[PDB]
Structure formats: structure tokens, C-alpha cells
Amino acid sequence: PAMLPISMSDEGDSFLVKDSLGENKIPKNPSKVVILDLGILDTFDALKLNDKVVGVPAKNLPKYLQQFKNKPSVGGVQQVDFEAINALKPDLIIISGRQSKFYDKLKEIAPTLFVGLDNANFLSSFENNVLSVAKLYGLEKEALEKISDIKNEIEKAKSIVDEDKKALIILTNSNKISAFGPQSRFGIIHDVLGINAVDENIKVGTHGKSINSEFILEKNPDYIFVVDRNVILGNKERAQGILDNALVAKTKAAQNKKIIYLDPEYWYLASGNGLESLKTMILEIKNAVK
Ligand SMILES: O=C(NCCCCCCCCNC(=O)c1cccc(O)c1O)c1cccc(O)c1O
Ligand SMILES: [Fe+3]
């Protein structure tokens, strides 16, 4: 079933808000927001809300968000510094799926809004997250224009896609490989941009289905989209070395130089959950397959 969305009613100087984790009273125009979703951080920047941001997970701050490098840190996306959050005295904390498990602890500190994406309904959830944040600040007009521009980009990207080619999405960690299909955390490649999948039913898991290079060759993708989690975790291994092997070399993707190394900060950290990231990621795909 679809994830429950964020819903809100206007309460004068505040909103009454419900999402899939719970209910909150959120002040209008919140002044001190701790943001633990990197995509939503980029939406705050797109909406010119940088001064509302009181703290960010500096351990995982992407290259494309370095304008937030002066903000107080609240740790990393997987290493949340609850003391730092408390010390910032936020009026609102914004989380996604990585921090759901700490919901009760965060809500003790301040109202806690969940903005995770629904992998089965990416665009609907994406719009709900953007427009909910925009509603808090009265920025619906600006947000809607930016969403309309993204939808136009989606159409332009779709128009260049080759109906007869198929792709596989993989993730590398350590010297290991895992795979992702349609309606996964990386599913927009298939679900929104219409690139065909080599396998419609790849076993779901947060960090993917363990596979070997024999599987890659068996599926013989035209494109391989690679997300190197090693870069995010600080491990020394790299995808370019893992995939330089005799099995992968026999794929159409290798033979046509269509092993595409996706920017892991966008794909794995932001997850396309921002006005900036999603636009940039659509272009990244388009330019890789045109
Ligand atoms: O809830 C999540 N992960 C919890 C994992 C807890 C146990 C393993 C922790 C050590 C391994 N993970 C990392 O060291 C890591 C570091 C930065 C960002 C990540 O996403 C990471 O998994 C999670 C949710 C959505 C997307 C993700 O991807 C996640 O993980
Ligand atoms: Fe993770």
C-alpha cells in the first residue's frame, strides 16, 4: 500500500500536522530547523530558507551543499548527535527513513516531521514533501514552479531513452555488489525516466540484494548504473576496481562504455528528495544515456 503522506491544517500561527510516524504542532515559519534529510536541506536552499536551518549532519554534508558548511553540526545521518540537537533548541526537526528508529527520542526535543520517500510512489511523495515544507513558509507558489520545471525535465529526459535497451542498478560496498530494481531506493531510473529493467523483481532490501558478477553477465544489461557506497562510508574499496573483471567485461554495458558511475552523495544520501537534487539527478541520467 502507499505510505501515508504528510497532511496539515492551518491553525493560525501554527499547523496541525500528521505523517506516517505521528502528529505534531509546527509553528508557521519555523526559525530553527534541524535537518537530517539531505534532500530536504537542498529544498530549503532552493526556497531561500538557509537562515532557518540551525543544524545539519556535517559528517555527511554533500559537495553540492557546502554552503551549509558553517552551520552547527548534529553529527551524521547514521550518527545523530542528540545532545547537539538539544543544545540548538530547535523549533522543528526534519527526518527521513534513517532516523525513524529514533523518533520518540527526537520528538522529546522538538516537533519531528517525517519526509521519507515512498519507493512505490516516488513523485507523489516527492511533491508531498516539497509542498509540505513550502506550506510551512507560505512558499507554495515558488515550490510549484520548481516542481513544474522538474516535470518538464522528466519529459525531456524520457524523450531520449532507447526503448530497446535495459539497465541494471548496482551498489558496491567493500568488495561486494548488491542489486536494486524498479520501485527501489534508486527506482526513478526505471519508474520515472522509463529506462527498462533487466529484472523487474530484484529482492528488496535497504542495502540491496547480494549478487555476483555472474548474475550481471546473465542478465546482460546494456547499461549498468553504479552507486559506490564505499565513498559514503569511507571504505577504501572502489567500484571501478570491483567491476574491472572478466565477467562484467563481457556485458554489453562494458563493451559500449555504459558502466555509469552515479554520484553517490546524490543517489545514496539525498535519494532524490530535494528540488535541487532531483533536477540534477534527472540530468545526470539523461546525459549518461543520450
Ligand atoms: O535505517 C537505516 N540504516 C540503519 C542501519 C543500522 C545498522 C548498520 C549501521 C552501519 C552501516 N551503515 C553505515 O555506516 C551508513 C553510513 C552512512 C549512511 C548510511 O545509509 C549507512 O548505511 C537506513 C534507512 C534508509 C536508508 C539507508 O541507507 C539506511 O542505512
Ligand atoms: Fe544506509
Author numbering: 21 to 310
From the article:
The periplasmic binding protein (PBP) CeuE1 is an important component of the Fe(III) uptake system in Campylobacter jejuni, a commensal Gram-negative bacterium in the avian gut, but a common source of food poisoning in humans. CeuE, an integral part of the CeuBCDE ABC transporter of C. jejuni, is responsible for capturing Fe(III)-siderophore complexes in the periplasm for delivery to their respective inner membrane transporter. C. jejuni does not itself synthesize siderophores, but capitalizes on their secretion by other bacteria, such as E. coli. Here we report a combined solution and structural study of a series of synthetic tetradentate analogues of the enterobactin-derived bis(2, 3-dihydroxybenzoyl-L-Ser), to explore the ligand-binding promiscuity of CeuE, both wild type and with mutations of the Fe(III) binding residues H227 and Y288.
